[PDB]
Structures are given as structure tokens and as C-alpha cells.
Write a protein that binds this ligand. Structure first.
Ligand SMILES: Nc1ncnc2c1ncn2[C@@H]1O[C@H](COP(=O)(O)OP(=O)(O)OP(=O)(O)O)[C@@H](O)[C@H]1O
Ligand SMILES: Nc1ncnc2c1ncn2[C@@H]1O[C@H](COP(=O)(O)OP(=O)(O)OP(=O)(O)O)[C@@H](O)[C@H]1O
Ligand SMILES: [Mg+2]
Ligand SMILES: [Mg+2]
Lengths: 572, 569
């Protein structure tokens, strides 16, 4: 609740910080000791060196070493910074591993392109910190405890002033440190908004060439930056406010010396007291910059509490192959506004089931449900009269292939877009058979050499027709028990998909297959068919069995029949 | 060529840096003066102050006021940092405006998700810099010139040592500054690779749940970070190397005082000489961190030389409406491997032309050409017997609508996905007619209130079916002379698109329309049709005119006829 205890708990999860820093902090302490001891000895030494040269050859060597050991402080600056580079790299490690094992039901709410900078830019603020953080704080805290003990009159008999220098200053940093905390949470919640704007803009540059967007999306960037980030000077204004305020209470201690305070002691008293400031200007800098870190990490804390959606809790059950039964499952994408209404159907093995619905139904959502992404409230999904959750959470995903309604590809270099299914044993003499079972090898070999070809970002390299045929090979290399085709009519011609339908029939005969498609002439011979509508389903059986029996549509097909009856009489 | 002259030229383009910094640098100079003058006066003052409380009270209250002007240094630290915040914001301004006016023929080569961080993270390295950069450099350079003049014996009669302290140190920083420059260009060319990895991964999280990717794409991140960025400690190792090496030449000057002065003031000479180090430790820090900036900006320079693809060179010609003629245009996406082979066809006005080709042809690469993105080598594109380049470069884009083969949407809040065509005069009582002409208003009004609805990143809140119908409204709000539909069969059903075809026929009758589509039953009544194949075209005329006459395919249609003959029997 104190916003401080989790932060040291946060760096605690990066384990190996304790080892080398403990050595690294130690020699920086004695670095403060030798810098304490240096200016008093040389002024007596030179008087000592009036003798000069003799003491000098030997002491020249001595000083070189000594002065070489004055350069040993650089090794402390190195070794702190090395463990400084360790602690940031542990954050980026632990942030990234949590980031992909968390449920997909998070990412739909908040902006994948926003949270990505919270890996980078909400760590790099601790790199610049941890030099000024540690090294400045330790070098002062020994000097201030080194001051008042040698200011021995003022901590045993004149204590009533050295109990004013810290606590009255401590009241001053409290609104500053709180305001410093309310700023660093804002900028770091706006760097993420700023980078999130651009990654939702820059890959879509072909649309932003709409010739009126370029005068506008530039204007959104400037309104992104200058109204916020030059308005990030609000940090720097308060940052410079600390200057007078440390002194404005410190000189208040200085005027206090006449209210309570022989004369031979007063002159030495001023001499030691003015050695406090360059120490005191460091410790307050640390307490400022510390609260800068917290607001830059307070957002990063909450994304370490979301609940680890991939479990490997496989109880006794992964392997056998049984039919799939949906049992009154009703899904809500938002729990007060649901779109699926206790649908109940059975997916028998070895036979291609299909799903056909109009635009706006629950077609694709039932597929994302059948990857067990949500497993909603009312209803259970079972297989073999066994509930699908208790098998495992996502080792059951391994048995299934899946292609989306769109065709997604990462920064591919084509052969790696197909590869990571079996992920270790790709068997290069088999990918071409997965290409031949997808009509891919025909229009790949004329390109420069399948490996050597590189797709774009979202896969621009290849085009749109080649995109869909590439992604369908991903499911046909994983060799699944259960296929899941979402759009086999998406971006491909009738010449292609006839080879596709004639290919997977050799594959899938004891391996059941759920495929939805537009344009019902691709699922006419399916062994089952469904007609889903707005979260409800009103159909069963074969298409010929459904056309004569059911009287709901009776022209969904005839909407597509009359679009094809024109082609006969126009040709003959 | 010197890698330095463009950098000061780079900040020169951010104009207003000259104004306030000149005031800001000035009072920091006299801040160095008062810090020079302070420790000598007080030690003589306290002996005169011991003339009691009286000596202190009334002069000392001004000394508090004097100590308030010691806090005036903070205002210099502020005003430097304020102009420090100005110069970074000018970079992000000038980088962003150049970034979107440059040709699309750049972005296909290098990785939009890579170059985006070069807006942010290759500017923020100058923010931390410019405090340590300027303020540290100015506060030393006056002190070192303030030292040797008060070390007056050693710059007129013992000069032969103060001509060693700088130039022999200057040899030492040369490999360091060069190595420091070869490091900062690497990390900043790897922050961009690291962020570019994630934005090509994180929005595709539904695919990365392939259950074997999570154990792998996590491993690519760690191999991204730890093999490179904990290996970014190579900076910090050389960064700490400067410590001995400034002194290891400085004490070499110290041993030199007996080689020329030992046979011949010496006690006061040591006292002023040891005041040089905390100055000298600042100036070398500046020359280190300066070369850190250059490698973090050398990549940023070259993206200010690419050539401004939107010109507003409209010569005399924007407005009239004439047919479109392609004349032997041959496009290469790579100039030694071209895919379009001097295609020649004519697009007559008022009549829907279509294009149908198999997978792998040049069907869209002719649409992206028809937005004048490339305008390739062999051949000219003309309209009205007038070449299309000399009209304007992209004010001609305003007359045209266009939807892609995919359906793209930005972070929308639906009404803003349709809005920025006319971009100032959206006329809220008309968007619904642009929705009614796209079969959008039917399945929008049941959602929570068209404005209030928000799509996802790539429209993931909306459907796939709803995505395509939304994007097609964008062209039907701009009210074009020329439509360009790329996939009216993409993600939409036969119930939808029959309304779509029956809608735009009321719109397009004197407004010509180029539409490609799968599944030839949507272009059967087109007034012209083309059959493009691998960059070549082998068809003309009407479909019924092409089916009997041409003998190339003769079963491209029959490939789709026999798939529909099963539905009757
Ligand atoms: N936030 C959301 N997440 C997931 N699905 C949503 C969300 N909001 C709405 N939906 C619904 O998801 C449904 C299913 O989309 P689907 O996968 O069926 O697209 P499709 O298969 O192309 O079919 P359609 O043609 O009906 O869009 C849509 O009806 C849409 O209303
Ligand atoms: N970024 C790119 N720019 C231009 N051409 C590309 C690019 N990436 C790949 N290509 C090549 O351009 C060819 C043309 O594809 P096109 O633009 O016609 O897409 P398409 O209309 O979907 O093609 P099809 O419908 O024939 O599959 C592809 O075969 C591909 O080899
Ligand atoms: Mg889908
Ligand atoms: Mg296309």
C-alpha cells in the first residue's frame, strides 16, 4: 500500500543482484573514505615535501599507485553499472515471459501496441537512475554521518540544531516527491499512448495515403507530442524547484546558530558545517529520482498479477481421439451482453462438419471458443463424455490446427512461417508435401528459392492470394487430428481450391474437420451442416436433408442459385 | 564526411534553440564566476565577522539573499533543460513529418515496426545528454581557462608543460571516442530490432497461441535481449575506462615538473594545479557523450534525405473527367525482376470494367500502380490523352476511392474510420447514407450507438464480416469519380452483396468503376473484362463475347459452373 515495498520486491525477483553489488558497494564505501582523507594530508605533506625530490621519486611512484588507486573508483562505477545493466535485463526478461502466457481476454481490452513500449521505455528509466540512485546515495550518507561526528560539539552539547537539518527538510520533499510521483506515472502512461498511436498508423501507410489523412495523422502526432511531451516539462519545473528548498531550510538552520549559541569553537564550526551541502545535494536527488522510478513502474506491477493462462496441468488425459460435444455453451464477450445462446451440437469423428451463417452471427467466435480461449459461464464443452478443461489447458491445442478468418504472418522468411509446429524436427523433406497438400509448391518454386524469399511485415512480400495458401500449410504441417479452416474461400481462386479439396480428403478420413466458408457450394457434400444465427442455431443434418425439411431460410441457397443460373443461358 | 557538421546542422533545423539558450548559457557563465570567487572571500570574511553577531546580522541577512542567488543556478538548470526539451521535440516533429510524406517504395524494404522506435528512442538519448552535454562543458571550459592564467608562471615562462596536458590527452580519447561511436550506432540499431520484433509478434497473439510458439517466441525475446542488451555492457566497460586514462596522462604532466622545473613558487604551483581535475573530468565526459549521440543519430540522418513523394505540383490539370488509358506499362517491384509486361488496355467512363486472374497474377499490383505509387519504367499511364503524372502527384488521389485486398482499420471508434475523406465537413446527416449504400446501418444500430463503439487494434472488436463492410463505406463517403473495389467477395455473404450491387448502380452511372473479384458470378454483366496472367493479359470484351471467341481458358468459368450444377439435382 506504501508504493515502496513492492518496488524492492520487484527487483528481488531478479535474483543475482545481491552477489556482485555487495562487492561493488563495498569498495565504493572505502572510496568515500579516501576522498574524505585526501585534502588534509597533502597540505601537511608538501610542507613535508619541502625536501621535495627525494621523497618524490619514491612518492611519485606512491602517488601514481595511489593515484592509480584513485582510478579504482572507475571499476566501482563499472561494476555498479554492470549490475545496473543486470537489473534492467532481468525486468525485460521477467516482463516478457509473463506477457505471452497471460490470457487473450486481456489483450482485447487494452491495446497491444500500447503495452509493447512498457517493455522498453518503462525499463530504461531505471538504467539512468541506478547510477545516480545508488552511487550518489551511498557517497553522501557516509559523509553526513562523517560530518556531525567531527562536528562533535553540535551532536552532544549543541544537538538542538542537527535535529533540525533533516526533519524540517523532510517536510519539504513530501509534496515534491508526491508531485514527482504523479508526473512519472503520466508520461510513462503517455509514451505508451504515443508509440501506440504510431504502430496503429505506420504499417497501414497504404490507407493513410487517402490524401487527406496525411494532413491529419501528422496533426495527431503533433497533438500527441507537443501537447503532452513538451508539456512533460512539468517534471523539469519541479525538478529544478528542489534547489532553493534544500538551502532555504538549510540556511534556516544557519540562522538558528545565533538563537542558541566559545568564539574559538564558532570559527571551526562554520568550517565543517559548509561541507554538508554537496553531500546534501546528492541525497535529495536520490529521493527525487526514486519516486520518478515508481510511477514509471507502478503500471508495470499490475501486469505481473494477471493469471498465467497456459498451465501444464494435464491430469491423466491428452491422447485419445473422441468426438466433440458442445453442451449448452453460452458465451459473453462482455458478461452483461452475451453473443452465444446455449448452443448444443455434436461433432462426430471422421466426417467434415460445416458451419454456415450470415454476417454477424457467431461463426468465428465459436472457433475461438473451440481453441479454449474463454470457456464461458453457462455450459460445458466435452469430448468423449469428458470435459475439455480437465485434459490440459493448452496441450490440447497441440492436437489441433487452426487458421484465422484473416491470414496472419509474422516477419517470416517463408519457411519459418510454417516451421514452429513440431518446432524441433521440421524434416525438410516433408514441408514440400505440406506445400503440395496446400497448392503452395506450384507458385513458390518460380520465386527465388523458398527459404531465400522474405515476406514483409504483415506479410506484404507475398500478396494476398499467396498469403492464404501459405497460412493453410501451417495447419497441414502440424498433422492434426482436428483441422479448423476458417476461410477456404478468402483469397484464392477456383483453380486453387479444387486441388485443396482433393488434397485433404486423402489426409482427413479418420481425422474430423470443422470448416466454415462463404458461398455454400464448397460444403454441399458435408456430412453435417449447421445454420447459426445471432448466437442461436436453427439447423442440422445434410444440406439436401436440410433444404427440404427446414423452412427457415429456403432461399439462402436460392440466393446463391439464381446468381449462377445466369451463366448457362449467357453462354448457351 | 566528418560526422560532426551534419549534427549541428541537424539541430539547426529546429529553429528556436538560439533564443532562450543564449540567455540561458549566459547566466550559467556568471554562475561559474561566483563559484570561482566564493571560497577565497569567506575565509577572510569570518575573521572580520568574528567582530560578532553585529558583523553577521545585517550583512548576513543579505548573505541569505546572496545565497538565494546561489539558487538562481537552478533557473539556469531549468532554462537549459527547457530548451533541452525543445530540441528533442523539434526532432520528433521534423522526423514525423518527413516520415509519412516519403514514398511507399521505401517501406516495403525496411520494416515499419523497426523504424517506429527511431522516433522515440533515438531522440530520448539526447534529453539525458543535453544537461551533461552543455552545462558540464561550459562549466569546465571557463575553469580551465581560469586556471592557467592564475597559474601565470606556467603559461608564460613554464609553458612547456601546459602544452602537454591537452594534446597528449587528446590522443587518448581518439580510439575511445571512435569506439564509443561504433557502439551507440549498434544499440540504437538493435533497440529498433528489438521493438520491431515485438510489434511483429504481440498483435498476432491469437496465432502465437499455437502452443509451441510460446516456448519459442519467448526464447527469441531472450535471445533478442540478453545476447544483445546485456551485451550492451560493452558501452559501459569503455565508459569506465576513461577514469584512469585522463589521470594517467595528467600525472605524466605531474612527473614532468621535475624534468624542467626541479633545478629552478613550487608550493603554490601544486595548489593551483590540483584544482584542474574536477574541471577536466567534465570536459572529457562531454566528448564521450557527444560521440554517443552521433551513432544514435547517424541512422536518423539518412531518413531525412528520402525524396518527399507527395508534391503539390498541380500544373494546370486536376478536374475534368476522362477515360483511363494504360499504355504498355511494365512494372518491376525489383528492377531486375519485373512482374508486369507492357500491359495495354483502356478504361472507358461510366461502365464497370473488371479484372479476373488466377492466384499469382498482377491483379492488384495493377491497382497499387493505379494509385500512382510507383509509375514504372517502360510505359506511361495517361487519361484523356494526357499523362497522369503531370496532373499532380497525389491530389489526383483525392478523386479516387480505394479499398485493399484486405480490410484495414486503424484504432477507429467506427465513425472516425469513415471520416477523414472530406476531413473537415463530414455532414453527420450523410454518413448513414454512406452506411445505407454499404449495407452497414442494418448491423450497426443494434450495437451500442455507432460513435460509442470502438474497434480493436486492427478492428478486432468488430467482426471479419463487419470489417469489410465498414471499409467499403470509406470509398462510398468520399463520393469519388472512380471507385476501386478489390474484394467484394472477401468477408460478406450473398445476402449482403446483393444489396451492395443494387446500391452502387444508383451511384455509379457516369462514374466509372474498376472492380476485381473472385468467383466470376459477380462480374458477369460487366461492360468489359480482362484476364490477366503472370504480368500478361490475354482477354478483352464482354464475358459472353470472351467465352465463345477466346480459346485460352474455355473452362475457367466451367471450373465454377460445375461447382454449382450439383445444387439443382
Ligand atoms: N470484442 C469481440 N470479440 C470477439 N467477437 C466479437 C466482439 N465484438 C463482437 N464480436 C462478434 O463476433 C462475431 C463473429 O465474427 P465471425 O468470426 O463470425 O466473423 P465471420 O466468421 O466472418 O462471420 P460474419 O460474416 O458473421 O462476420 C460477430 O458477430 C461480432 O458481433
Ligand atoms: N510488396 C510487394 N509489392 C509488389 N509485389 C509483390 C510484393 N510482395 C510480393 N509481390 C509479388 O507480387 C505478385 C502480385 O500479387 P498481387 O499484387 O496481384 O496480389 P493478388 O491480386 O492477391 O494476386 P492473386 O490474386 O493473383 O493471388 C505476387 O505474386 C508476389 O510475388
Ligand atoms: Mg473467422
Ligand atoms: Mg488485392
Amino acid at each position: 500500500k506504501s508504493k515502496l515495498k513492492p518496488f524492492f520486491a520487484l527487483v528481488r525477483r531478479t535474483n543475482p543482484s545481491y552477489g556482485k553489488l555487495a562487492f561493488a558497494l563495498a569498495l565504493s564505501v572505502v572510496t568515500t573514505l579516501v576522498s574524505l582523507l585526501i585534502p588534509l594530508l597533502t597540505k601537511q605533506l608538501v610542507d613535508g615535501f619541502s625536501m621535495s625530490n627525494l621523497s618524490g621519486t619514491q612518492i611519485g611512484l606512491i602517488a601514481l599507485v595511489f593515484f592509480v588507486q584513485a582510478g579504482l573508483s572507475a571499476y566501482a562505477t563499472y561494476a555498479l553499472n554492470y549490475n545496473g545493466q543486470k537489473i534492467i535485463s532481468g525486468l525485460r526478461e521477467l516482463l516478457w515471459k509473463k506477457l505471452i502466457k497471460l490470457p487473450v481476454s486481456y489483450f482485447d481490452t487494452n491495446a497491444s501496441g500500447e503495452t509493447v513500449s512498457r517493455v522498453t521505455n518503462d525499463t530504461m528509466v531505471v538504467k539512468e537512475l541506478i547510477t545516480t540512485h545508488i552511487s550518489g546515495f551511498i557517497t553522501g550518507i557516509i559523509s553526513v554521518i562523517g560530518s556531525l561526528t567531527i562536528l562533535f560539539i553540535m551532536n552532544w552539547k549543541l544537538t538542538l540544531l542537527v535535529l533540525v537539518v533533516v526533519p524540517l527538510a523532510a517536510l519539504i520533499l513530501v509534496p515534491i516527491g508526491r508531485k514527482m510521483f504523479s508526473i512519472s506515472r503520466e508520461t510513462q502512461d503517455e509514451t505508451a499512448r504515443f508509440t501506440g498511436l504510431l504502430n496503429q498508423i505506420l504499417p497501414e501507410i497504404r490507407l493513410v495515403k487517402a490524401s487527406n489523412a496525411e494532413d491529419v495523422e501528422y496533426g495527431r502526432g503533433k497533438m500527441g507530442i507537443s501537447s503532452l511531451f513538451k508539456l512533460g516539462v512539468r517534471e523539469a519545473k519541479v525538478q529544478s524547484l528542489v534547489g532553493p528548498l534544500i538551502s532555504l531550510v538549510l540556511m534556516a538552520a544557519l540562522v538558528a546558530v545565533i538563537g542558541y549559541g566559545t568564539a574559538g569553537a564558532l570559527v571551526a564550526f562554520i568550517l565543517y558545517l559548509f561541507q554538508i551541502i554537496m553531500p546534501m545535494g546528492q541525497i535529495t536527488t536520490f529521493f527525487t529520482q526514486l519516486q520518478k522510478s515508481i510511477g514509471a513502474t507502478e503500471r508495470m506491477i499490475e501486469i505481473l498479477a494477471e493469471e498465467e493462462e497456459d498451465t501444464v496441468t494435464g491430469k491423466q488425459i491428452e491422447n485419445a481421439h473422441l468426438p466433440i460435444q458442445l453442451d449448452r455453451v453460452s458465451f459473453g464477450y462482455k458478461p452483461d451482453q452475451l453473443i452465444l445462446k446455449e448452443v448444443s451440437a455434436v461433432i462426430e469423428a471422421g466426417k467434415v462438419t460445416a458451419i454456415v451463417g450470415p454476417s454477424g452471427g457467431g461463426k468465428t467466435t465459436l472457433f475461438k471458443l473451440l481453441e479454449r480461449f474463454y470457456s464461458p459461464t453457462a455450459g460445458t464443452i466435452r469430448l468423449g463424455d469428458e470435459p475439455v478443461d480437465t485434459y490440459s489447458l493448452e496441450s490440447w491445442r497441440e492436437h489441433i490446427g487452426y487458421v484465422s478468418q484473416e491470414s496472419p504472418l509474422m516477419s517470416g522468411t517463408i519457411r519459418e512461417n510454417i516451421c514452429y509446429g513440431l518446432e524441433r524436427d521440421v524434416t525438410d523433406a516433408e514441408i514440400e508435401k505440406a506445400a503440395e497438400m496446400a497448392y503452395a509448391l506450384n507458385f513458390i518454386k518460380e520465386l527465388p528459392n523458398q527459404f531465400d524469399t522474405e515476406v514483409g511485415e504483415r506479410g506484404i512480400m507475398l500478396s494476398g492470394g499467396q498469403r492464404q495458401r501459405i497460412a493453410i500449410a501451417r495447419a497441414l504441417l502440424r498433422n492434426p487430428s482436428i483441422l479448423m479452416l476458417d476461410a477456404a474461400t478468402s483469397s484464392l481462386d477456383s483453380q486453387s481450391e479444387k486441388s485443396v479439396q482433393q488434397a485433404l480428403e486423402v489426409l482427413m478420413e479418420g481425422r474430423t474437420t470443422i470448416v466454415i466458408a462463404h458461398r455454400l457450394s464448397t460444403v454441399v457434400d458435408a456430412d453435417q451442416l449447421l445454420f447459426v444465427e445471432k448466437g442461436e442455431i436453427t439447423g442440422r443434418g445434410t444440406h439436401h436433408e436440410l433444404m427440404a425439411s427446414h423452412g427457415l431460410y429456403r432461399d439462402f441457397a436460392e440466393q446463391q442459385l439464381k446468381m449462377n443460373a445466369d451463366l448457362e443461358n449467357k453462354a448457351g
